[PDB]
Amino acid sequence: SGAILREVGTTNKTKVSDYEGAINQNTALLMKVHKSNFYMEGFVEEVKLEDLVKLGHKYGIPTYYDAGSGLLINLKEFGISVDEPNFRDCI
Amino acid sequence: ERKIKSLMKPNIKRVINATGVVINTNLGRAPLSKDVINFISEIANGYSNLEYNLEEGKRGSRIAHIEKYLNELTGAESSFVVNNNAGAVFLVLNTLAEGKEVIISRGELVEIGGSFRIPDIMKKSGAILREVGTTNKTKVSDYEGAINQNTALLMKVHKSNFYMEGFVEEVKLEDLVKLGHKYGIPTYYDAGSGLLINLKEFGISVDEPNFRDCISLGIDLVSGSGDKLLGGPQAGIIVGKKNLIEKIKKNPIARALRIDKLTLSGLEMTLKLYFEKRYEDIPVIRMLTQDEKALRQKAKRLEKLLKDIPGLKISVIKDKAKPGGGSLPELELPTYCVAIRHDRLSSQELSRRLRLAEPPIVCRIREDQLLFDMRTVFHEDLKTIKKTLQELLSI
Amino acid sequence: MKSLLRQIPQISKVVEIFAKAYPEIYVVKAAREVAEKYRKEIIEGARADLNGFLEDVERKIKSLMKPNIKRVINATGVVINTNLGRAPLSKDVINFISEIANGYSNLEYNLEEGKRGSRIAHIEKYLNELTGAESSFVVNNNAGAVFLVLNTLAEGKEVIISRGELVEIGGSFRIPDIMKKSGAILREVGTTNKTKVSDYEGAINQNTALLMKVHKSNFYMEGFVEEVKLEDLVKLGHKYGIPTYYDAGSGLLINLKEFGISVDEPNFRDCISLGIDLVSGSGDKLLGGPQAGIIVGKKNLIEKIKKNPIARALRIDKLTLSGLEMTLKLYFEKRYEDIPVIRMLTQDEKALRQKAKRLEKLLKDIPGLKISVIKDKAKPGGGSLPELELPTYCVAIRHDRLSSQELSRRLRLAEPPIVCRIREDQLLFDMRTVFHEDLKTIKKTLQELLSI
Amino acid sequence: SGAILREVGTTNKTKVSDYEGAINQNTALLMKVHKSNFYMEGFVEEVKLEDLVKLGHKYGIPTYYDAGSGLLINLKEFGISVDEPNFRDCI
């Protein structure tokens, strides 16, 4: 894709600090990918989305979420209780 | 009288573990057998031949006492031991890859404990970190593809305190050895659990890796904490090729990591046990291998003790928990909990008061039902359990 | 000669002879070794009698079952004896350790909040109080404590140190060798015997991150020798804005003159209040504790050292951590006589003779023993007090049959083993280091060596 | 002097590996100075003079000893027993 890849944090855990820490002159994009075809349990940490946006509005960098599952609406409305994100809510 | 009690007491106190988690990072990992503790008590009581060789009457290496045990149990060429596993990695890196590349799966860059992080230490290690594959999946090609002139080291970390399910792929150990002997690169496995023997022999069926087996697979180096699945005092344990061990040894940083007199001795005793197949004598092995019947056995001997105490609702449930905390993330075994509830007091306030007892007791909470897992409880605790509850509830 | 070799019993019958006598795995390892020794000695025609076999397979088993690591009876009169395992521990301590080790403990657990907590947290409160520094921390041993403070504060920057202070203590620790691995760049001022203030001031620059001073623990220079007064380093620091780091190494917790021993040995309390920013020292020297690197000083600095991702490779074990709190407790309770290294060095000259003659009284009967008690000046501190010269009573001995050398050798192979000074074919025993319950053990040791 | 100074070992101790370790293309000189007006006791190690010579005759390097005392003869011959080094013997 031509982009230069900057991998912050560690497999199981990632704090907000790790993101903010690697920002710079050449940082054009904050990207978050949803772990769709696997999952980690055990000692595991993830960056809350609101945090990334705040962090973006702070330095003036665009945020980009790959949901992948591409879920249109809230699923809890149907009786399924899951945290799966959706476009509406993510926007 | 209460000030006198507090005004007299150590910040560090023994604690009664009811959580049913054998390797409990917070509660002090593997606790120690009386025989060992008496061997330790004896060597600390006066002077001893720690750095002293008695035959030659001149100074000697304190790591010499033990390395005989490790060489025999694992099968490796030589061995060594440092403060903990943290430093056992940091030593192998700064020793064998200062300034050169180390290849490792992007799935295996772990954050264990609050301050340890392979990417954050390996950095300070001076080694350059080369991360192959992807989070969930990593083939053998990924490892092979990032080899080059600078590649000093093929490192594989065992995900001790987590696991991945769903679509996930891992590189086989036999595979990483083949890849090594191909390019002439050494293989370094951080077991972390420091499992010393096959675990299936005792009826628990898991794939957890162990020294003996990891070594006779052809890995060049293997490390692990002593105070995890080994059942001993805190120690970084390194076994493998002689040429490498000697290089690690000579590293001037190995002195800032050399192990203390207490843990050294206590380890020799712990190792002596293993040679004598006395497995039941090392706490973390017996606890995890106890008979399901054995656990009920202990569950109802406790319930028989608390029937008299006022306002106590006692029941024995059969629940499935996850025993291994810092070493066995996926494991799930059956154990008997004595769930209790007091009409006057609520589950939350109860824990709180139990943590402030003398001795203090720490346990699990699930739906306003206090729970005592018997997998971690010693017999002499039962009398103290009953004596602390009746003091909280009839006072 | 094959009928004298067919007399050797097979491994299974040795198994039967000692059934519960000894573990099955050792006895088989003791028959296999003794059977290769009798197979080779009879083939070469060196053995006509096989009767020593039953006794010899039992000795191997006793031996093959024995710890390489054993308690040993120190007669050299050296308190801090690096080879013999530095500061031994009071029963109170060992019990407090025993207890924390027999089960689970609030090691990493805060009971209040019911949430994990730093294990370093239990101790530091004691340290801040005894030393008077702003904050404190603890790592495996002083070795790594140096390494930490350099790599935290000076990686890639200049550390100025006196050319006279670059020590080699122990076998593999060397300030230049480690400082290198630390990553810090090493600027050495002055010269061996002399080093004035100007030498420090003079090599300062933009890249100078640290003014380090190491104490000469295991040696000393006499003759034309100058040294820079501590009060002067600190002034030099506070002038240019540079932290000062003192490796005391002895880890002396208090003023030592208060006990009647008059030396200039520096101590945390006193060094901190002088205005130094950082100080370290081993826990198994003059502290009297188990093995540990102890760092005290300015908060901002400790926080920095704490945050360093190597701190986790140095972090102390459950045993040393506990034993250390029990031994710091003692110090708050002015219980000094309970920590062995302090009591052995502060013992009354009278006390010493008293034990000297109580031993003499135990060796009179034993055959061929030439027993005398002399008053000698020796040097008690091995790893922390090099110059200290104190009077102490030794029971010099000599046997007409055996020579002093052989005697030492056998004393080192006894159970328990006893190591002691040699001086002109006169075995010596300095009572500085000897516990009373040993005196009986000694006499029972000697009577069994000479009369057997 | 204009010489480039390469300082091996440590204050109290110095083995032979320390000298041999720092040898290279630039090394023109193996020098030992005698501690005339001071001395060290405690744990102390020094490099044997027979050893420095063997070392130099190995790489083809000259050895230079600054006695300083400039003792001219063996001093034990007068009943005073010390190890002070002297010209005749050192040569």
Short mmCIF file of N, CA and C in Angstrom, two decimals, chain B residues 2-131:
data_model
loop_
_atom_site.label_atom_id
_atom_site.label_comp_id
_atom_site.label_asym_id
_atom_site.label_seq_id
_atom_site.Cartn_x
_atom_site.Cartn_y
_atom_site.Cartn_z
N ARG B 2 -5.50 -3.53 70.15
CA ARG B 2 -5.45 -3.59 68.68
C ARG B 2 -4.25 -2.81 68.09
N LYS B 3 -3.90 -1.69 68.72
CA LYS B 3 -2.70 -0.93 68.36
C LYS B 3 -1.46 -1.78 68.63
N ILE B 4 -1.40 -2.38 69.82
CA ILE B 4 -0.32 -3.30 70.18
C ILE B 4 -0.15 -4.39 69.09
N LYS B 5 -1.27 -4.99 68.67
CA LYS B 5 -1.26 -6.01 67.61
C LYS B 5 -0.66 -5.46 66.31
N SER B 6 -1.18 -4.32 65.87
CA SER B 6 -0.69 -3.71 64.64
C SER B 6 0.71 -3.14 64.80
N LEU B 7 0.94 -2.45 65.92
CA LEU B 7 2.24 -1.83 66.18
C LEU B 7 3.37 -2.87 66.15
N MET B 8 3.01 -4.15 66.13
CA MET B 8 4.02 -5.21 66.21
C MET B 8 4.20 -6.01 64.92
N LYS B 9 3.43 -5.72 63.89
CA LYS B 9 3.37 -6.69 62.81
C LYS B 9 4.00 -6.25 61.48
N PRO B 10 4.70 -7.19 60.81
CA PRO B 10 5.41 -7.08 59.53
C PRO B 10 4.50 -6.75 58.35
N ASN B 11 4.96 -5.91 57.44
CA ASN B 11 4.19 -5.63 56.23
C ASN B 11 3.93 -6.92 55.46
N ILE B 12 4.92 -7.82 55.47
CA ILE B 12 4.82 -9.11 54.79
C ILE B 12 4.34 -10.17 55.77
N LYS B 13 3.17 -10.74 55.50
CA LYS B 13 2.61 -11.77 56.38
C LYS B 13 2.16 -12.99 55.58
N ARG B 14 2.19 -14.17 56.19
CA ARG B 14 1.65 -15.31 55.49
C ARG B 14 0.18 -15.04 55.21
N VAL B 15 -0.33 -15.60 54.11
CA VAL B 15 -1.73 -15.42 53.72
C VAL B 15 -2.35 -16.73 53.25
N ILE B 16 -3.60 -16.98 53.66
CA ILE B 16 -4.33 -18.20 53.31
C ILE B 16 -5.09 -18.08 51.99
N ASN B 17 -4.61 -18.83 51.00
CA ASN B 17 -5.06 -18.69 49.63
C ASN B 17 -6.25 -19.58 49.33
N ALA B 18 -7.40 -18.95 49.13
CA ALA B 18 -8.62 -19.69 48.90
C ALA B 18 -9.06 -19.62 47.45
N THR B 19 -8.30 -18.91 46.62
CA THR B 19 -8.71 -18.64 45.23
C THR B 19 -8.62 -19.85 44.31
N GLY B 20 -7.82 -20.83 44.71
CA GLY B 20 -7.75 -22.07 43.95
C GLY B 20 -6.86 -21.89 42.75
N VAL B 21 -6.04 -20.85 42.80
CA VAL B 21 -5.05 -20.59 41.77
C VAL B 21 -3.68 -20.92 42.33
N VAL B 22 -3.15 -22.03 41.86
CA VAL B 22 -1.87 -22.51 42.34
C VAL B 22 -0.75 -21.47 42.14
N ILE B 23 -0.45 -21.10 40.89
CA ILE B 23 0.58 -20.09 40.59
C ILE B 23 0.01 -18.69 40.62
N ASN B 24 -0.09 -18.11 41.81
CA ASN B 24 -0.79 -16.85 41.96
C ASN B 24 0.15 -15.66 42.04
N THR B 25 0.40 -15.06 40.88
CA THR B 25 1.31 -13.93 40.75
C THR B 25 1.31 -12.96 41.95
N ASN B 26 0.13 -12.60 42.44
CA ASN B 26 0.02 -11.65 43.54
C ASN B 26 0.34 -12.23 44.92
N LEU B 27 -0.02 -13.49 45.13
CA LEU B 27 0.13 -14.11 46.45
C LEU B 27 1.48 -14.79 46.69
N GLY B 28 2.42 -14.62 45.76
CA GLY B 28 3.77 -15.09 45.99
C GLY B 28 4.14 -16.39 45.30
N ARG B 29 3.49 -16.68 44.18
CA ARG B 29 3.86 -17.82 43.32
C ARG B 29 4.11 -19.07 44.18
N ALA B 30 4.86 -20.04 43.66
CA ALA B 30 5.05 -21.33 44.33
C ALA B 30 5.56 -21.25 45.77
N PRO B 31 4.74 -21.72 46.74
CA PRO B 31 5.16 -21.80 48.14
C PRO B 31 6.01 -23.05 48.37
N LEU B 32 6.74 -23.12 49.49
CA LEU B 32 7.87 -24.05 49.63
C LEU B 32 7.71 -25.14 50.70
N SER B 33 8.16 -26.35 50.37
CA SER B 33 8.06 -27.49 51.28
C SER B 33 8.95 -27.34 52.51
N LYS B 34 8.49 -27.90 53.62
CA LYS B 34 9.18 -27.76 54.89
C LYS B 34 10.61 -28.28 54.83
N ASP B 35 10.83 -29.42 54.18
CA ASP B 35 12.18 -29.96 54.04
C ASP B 35 13.11 -28.95 53.42
N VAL B 36 12.67 -28.36 52.32
CA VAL B 36 13.45 -27.34 51.66
C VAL B 36 13.69 -26.21 52.66
N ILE B 37 12.62 -25.62 53.18
CA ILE B 37 12.78 -24.48 54.08
C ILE B 37 13.70 -24.75 55.26
N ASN B 38 13.80 -26.01 55.68
CA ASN B 38 14.74 -26.36 56.73
C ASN B 38 16.19 -26.47 56.22
N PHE B 39 16.34 -26.90 54.97
CA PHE B 39 17.65 -26.89 54.32
C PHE B 39 18.14 -25.46 54.16
N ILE B 40 17.21 -24.56 53.84
CA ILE B 40 17.51 -23.14 53.72
C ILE B 40 17.86 -22.52 55.08
N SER B 41 17.04 -22.85 56.08
CA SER B 41 17.22 -22.36 57.44
C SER B 41 18.61 -22.73 57.96
N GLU B 42 19.03 -23.94 57.63
CA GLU B 42 20.33 -24.46 58.04
C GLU B 42 21.52 -23.75 57.39
N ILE B 43 21.42 -23.46 56.09
CA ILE B 43 22.55 -22.84 55.41
C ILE B 43 22.65 -21.35 55.74
N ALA B 44 21.55 -20.74 56.17
CA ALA B 44 21.58 -19.32 56.47
C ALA B 44 22.02 -19.07 57.90
N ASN B 45 21.94 -20.13 58.72
CA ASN B 45 22.19 -20.06 60.16
C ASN B 45 23.63 -19.71 60.51
N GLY B 46 24.56 -20.14 59.67
CA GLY B 46 25.94 -19.77 59.86
C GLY B 46 26.63 -19.68 58.53
N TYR B 47 27.95 -19.83 58.55
CA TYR B 47 28.75 -19.84 57.33
C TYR B 47 28.61 -21.17 56.59
N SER B 48 28.90 -21.14 55.29
CA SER B 48 28.70 -22.29 54.40
C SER B 48 29.63 -22.18 53.21
N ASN B 49 29.70 -23.23 52.39
CA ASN B 49 30.69 -23.27 51.30
C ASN B 49 30.19 -22.75 49.93
N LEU B 50 29.25 -21.81 49.97
CA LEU B 50 28.71 -21.09 48.81
C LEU B 50 29.73 -20.86 47.70
N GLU B 51 30.66 -19.94 47.94
CA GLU B 51 31.69 -19.66 46.95
C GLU B 51 32.95 -20.50 47.21
N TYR B 52 32.90 -21.44 48.15
CA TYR B 52 34.11 -22.16 48.57
C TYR B 52 34.12 -23.63 48.17
N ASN B 53 35.13 -24.02 47.41
CA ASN B 53 35.31 -25.43 47.11
C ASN B 53 36.12 -26.07 48.23
N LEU B 54 35.56 -27.08 48.87
CA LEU B 54 36.23 -27.69 50.01
C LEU B 54 37.41 -28.59 49.64
N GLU B 55 37.33 -29.25 48.50
CA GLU B 55 38.41 -30.11 48.04
C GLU B 55 39.70 -29.34 47.85
N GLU B 56 39.63 -28.30 47.04
CA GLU B 56 40.80 -27.54 46.63
C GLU B 56 41.12 -26.42 47.62
N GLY B 57 40.23 -26.19 48.57
CA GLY B 57 40.45 -25.15 49.57
C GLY B 57 40.61 -23.74 49.03
N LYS B 58 40.21 -23.52 47.78
CA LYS B 58 40.24 -22.18 47.19
C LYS B 58 38.84 -21.76 46.77
N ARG B 59 38.67 -20.49 46.42
CA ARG B 59 37.36 -20.01 46.00
C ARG B 59 36.85 -20.81 44.80
N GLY B 60 35.54 -20.94 44.69
CA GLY B 60 34.93 -21.66 43.59
C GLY B 60 33.67 -20.96 43.12
N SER B 61 33.03 -21.52 42.09
CA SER B 61 31.83 -20.88 41.56
C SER B 61 30.59 -21.43 42.24
N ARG B 62 29.76 -20.52 42.74
CA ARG B 62 28.57 -20.88 43.50
C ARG B 62 27.50 -21.53 42.62
N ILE B 63 27.60 -21.32 41.31
CA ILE B 63 26.66 -21.92 40.36
C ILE B 63 27.06 -23.37 40.06
N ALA B 64 28.16 -23.80 40.66
CA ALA B 64 28.69 -25.13 40.40
C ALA B 64 27.92 -26.19 41.18
N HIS B 65 27.35 -25.78 42.31
CA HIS B 65 26.65 -26.70 43.20
C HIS B 65 25.46 -27.32 42.51
N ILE B 66 24.77 -26.49 41.75
CA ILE B 66 23.50 -26.85 41.14
C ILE B 66 23.65 -27.46 39.76
N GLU B 67 24.52 -26.88 38.95
CA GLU B 67 24.53 -27.22 37.53
C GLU B 67 24.59 -28.72 37.29
N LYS B 68 25.04 -29.47 38.29
CA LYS B 68 25.04 -30.93 38.18
C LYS B 68 23.62 -31.50 38.11
N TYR B 69 22.73 -30.94 38.92
CA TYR B 69 21.34 -31.36 38.91
C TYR B 69 20.66 -31.04 37.58
N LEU B 70 20.80 -29.80 37.11
CA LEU B 70 20.15 -29.38 35.87
C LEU B 70 20.61 -30.18 34.65
N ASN B 71 21.92 -30.43 34.55
CA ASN B 71 22.48 -31.23 33.46
C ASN B 71 21.85 -32.63 33.36
N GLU B 72 21.50 -33.21 34.51
CA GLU B 72 20.99 -34.58 34.56
C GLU B 72 19.49 -34.68 34.26
N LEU B 73 18.72 -33.71 34.77
CA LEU B 73 17.27 -33.73 34.62
C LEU B 73 16.83 -33.32 33.22
N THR B 74 17.50 -32.33 32.65
CA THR B 74 17.13 -31.86 31.32
C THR B 74 17.78 -32.69 30.21
N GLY B 75 19.08 -32.90 30.31
CA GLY B 75 19.81 -33.58 29.26
C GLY B 75 20.70 -32.63 28.47
N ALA B 76 20.57 -31.34 28.76
CA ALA B 76 21.39 -30.32 28.10
C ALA B 76 22.87 -30.56 28.37
N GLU B 77 23.71 -29.86 27.62
CA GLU B 77 25.16 -29.99 27.75
C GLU B 77 25.69 -29.29 29.01
N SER B 78 25.18 -28.09 29.27
CA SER B 78 25.57 -27.36 30.46
C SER B 78 24.41 -26.47 30.87
N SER B 79 24.53 -25.86 32.04
CA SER B 79 23.46 -25.06 32.59
C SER B 79 23.97 -23.93 33.44
N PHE B 80 23.06 -23.07 33.87
CA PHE B 80 23.39 -21.82 34.55
C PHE B 80 22.10 -21.33 35.18
N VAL B 81 22.18 -20.38 36.10
CA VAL B 81 20.99 -19.85 36.77
C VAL B 81 21.16 -18.43 37.27
N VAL B 82 20.19 -17.56 36.98
CA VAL B 82 20.28 -16.15 37.38
C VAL B 82 19.02 -15.70 38.11
N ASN B 83 19.03 -14.46 38.59
CA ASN B 83 18.01 -13.97 39.51
C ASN B 83 16.62 -14.49 39.23
N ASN B 84 16.13 -14.25 38.01
CA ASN B 84 14.80 -14.68 37.59
C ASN B 84 14.78 -14.94 36.10
N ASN B 85 13.62 -15.24 35.52
CA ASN B 85 13.59 -15.47 34.08
C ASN B 85 13.78 -14.17 33.31
N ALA B 86 13.23 -13.08 33.86
CA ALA B 86 13.36 -11.75 33.25
C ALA B 86 14.78 -11.55 32.80
N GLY B 87 15.70 -11.59 33.76
CA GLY B 87 17.12 -11.46 33.49
C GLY B 87 17.74 -12.61 32.71
N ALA B 88 17.14 -13.80 32.77
CA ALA B 88 17.64 -14.94 32.01
C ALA B 88 17.49 -14.70 30.51
N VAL B 89 16.41 -14.03 30.12
CA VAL B 89 16.28 -13.57 28.74
C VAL B 89 17.32 -12.47 28.48
N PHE B 90 17.11 -11.32 29.11
CA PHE B 90 18.03 -10.18 29.04
C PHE B 90 19.50 -10.54 29.00
N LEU B 91 19.86 -11.66 29.62
CA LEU B 91 21.24 -12.14 29.59
C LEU B 91 21.53 -12.87 28.28
N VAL B 92 20.62 -13.74 27.86
CA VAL B 92 20.85 -14.50 26.64
C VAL B 92 20.92 -13.54 25.45
N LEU B 93 20.09 -12.50 25.45
CA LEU B 93 20.14 -11.52 24.37
C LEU B 93 21.42 -10.69 24.38
N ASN B 94 21.67 -9.97 25.47
CA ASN B 94 22.86 -9.15 25.52
C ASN B 94 24.11 -9.97 25.31
N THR B 95 24.01 -11.28 25.54
CA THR B 95 25.18 -12.14 25.39
C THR B 95 25.39 -12.55 23.96
N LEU B 96 24.33 -13.05 23.34
CA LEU B 96 24.45 -13.68 22.02
C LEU B 96 24.00 -12.82 20.83
N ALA B 97 23.36 -11.68 21.10
CA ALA B 97 22.85 -10.84 20.01
C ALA B 97 22.97 -9.33 20.22
N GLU B 98 23.86 -8.90 21.12
CA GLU B 98 24.09 -7.46 21.28
C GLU B 98 24.41 -6.99 19.90
N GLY B 99 23.66 -6.01 19.42
CA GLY B 99 23.94 -5.37 18.14
C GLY B 99 23.55 -6.12 16.87
N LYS B 100 23.03 -7.34 17.01
CA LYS B 100 22.59 -8.12 15.86
C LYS B 100 21.08 -8.42 15.94
N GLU B 101 20.50 -8.97 14.88
CA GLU B 101 19.06 -9.20 14.82
C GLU B 101 18.63 -10.47 15.53
N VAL B 102 17.47 -10.42 16.17
CA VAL B 102 16.77 -11.58 16.75
C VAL B 102 15.38 -11.69 16.10
N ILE B 103 15.11 -12.87 15.54
CA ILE B 103 13.83 -13.15 14.90
C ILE B 103 12.85 -13.79 15.89
N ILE B 104 11.60 -13.33 15.90
CA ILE B 104 10.62 -13.82 16.87
C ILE B 104 9.19 -13.57 16.36
N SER B 105 8.26 -14.49 16.63
CA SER B 105 6.89 -14.34 16.10
C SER B 105 6.13 -13.13 16.66
N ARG B 106 5.45 -12.40 15.77
CA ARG B 106 4.69 -11.22 16.19
C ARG B 106 3.57 -11.64 17.14
N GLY B 107 3.30 -12.94 17.20
CA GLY B 107 2.33 -13.44 18.14
C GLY B 107 2.92 -13.59 19.53
N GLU B 108 4.24 -13.66 19.60
CA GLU B 108 4.93 -14.00 20.84
C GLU B 108 5.61 -12.82 21.55
N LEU B 109 5.32 -11.59 21.12
CA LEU B 109 5.81 -10.40 21.85
C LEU B 109 4.92 -10.09 23.05
N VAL B 110 5.26 -10.67 24.20
CA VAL B 110 4.35 -10.70 25.35
C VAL B 110 4.56 -9.58 26.36
N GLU B 111 3.52 -9.26 27.13
CA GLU B 111 3.63 -8.33 28.25
C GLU B 111 3.22 -9.05 29.51
N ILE B 112 4.19 -9.62 30.21
CA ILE B 112 3.91 -10.44 31.39
C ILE B 112 4.31 -9.66 32.65
N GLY B 113 3.47 -9.68 33.69
CA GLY B 113 3.70 -8.82 34.84
C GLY B 113 3.53 -7.36 34.43
N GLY B 114 3.71 -6.41 35.36
CA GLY B 114 3.46 -5.00 35.09
C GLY B 114 4.51 -4.20 34.32
N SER B 115 5.76 -4.68 34.38
CA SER B 115 6.96 -3.97 33.87
C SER B 115 7.70 -4.73 32.78
N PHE B 116 7.54 -6.06 32.74
CA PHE B 116 8.20 -6.87 31.71
C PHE B 116 7.46 -6.87 30.37
N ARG B 117 8.24 -6.67 29.31
CA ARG B 117 7.77 -6.65 27.95
C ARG B 117 8.97 -7.02 27.07
N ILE B 118 8.93 -8.19 26.44
CA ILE B 118 9.99 -8.62 25.52
C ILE B 118 10.45 -7.52 24.57
N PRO B 119 9.52 -6.73 24.00
CA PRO B 119 10.01 -5.66 23.14
C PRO B 119 10.71 -4.55 23.91
N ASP B 120 10.32 -4.31 25.16
CA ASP B 120 10.89 -3.23 25.97
C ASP B 120 12.20 -3.62 26.65
N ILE B 121 12.34 -4.91 26.98
CA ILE B 121 13.59 -5.42 27.53
C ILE B 121 14.60 -5.75 26.45
N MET B 122 14.18 -6.54 25.46
CA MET B 122 15.06 -6.94 24.38
C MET B 122 15.74 -5.70 23.79
N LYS B 123 14.99 -4.60 23.72
CA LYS B 123 15.57 -3.32 23.35
C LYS B 123 16.75 -2.99 24.26
N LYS B 124 16.48 -2.74 25.55
CA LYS B 124 17.56 -2.51 26.51
C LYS B 124 18.59 -3.64 26.47
N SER B 125 18.22 -4.82 25.98
CA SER B 125 19.18 -5.91 25.85
C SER B 125 20.30 -5.57 24.88
N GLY B 126 20.08 -4.56 24.05
CA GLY B 126 21.00 -4.22 22.98
C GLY B 126 20.82 -5.02 21.68
N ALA B 127 19.91 -6.00 21.68
CA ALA B 127 19.69 -6.82 20.49
C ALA B 127 18.69 -6.08 19.63
N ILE B 128 18.76 -6.28 18.31
CA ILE B 128 17.81 -5.67 17.38
C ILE B 128 16.70 -6.65 17.07
N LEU B 129 15.46 -6.22 17.27
CA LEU B 129 14.32 -7.13 17.28
C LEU B 129 13.62 -7.25 15.90
N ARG B 130 13.54 -8.47 15.36
CA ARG B 130 12.96 -8.68 14.02
C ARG B 130 11.74 -9.56 14.10
N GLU B 131 10.58 -8.93 13.97
CA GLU B 131 9.28 -9.53 14.26
C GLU B 131 8.59 -10.03 12.99
#
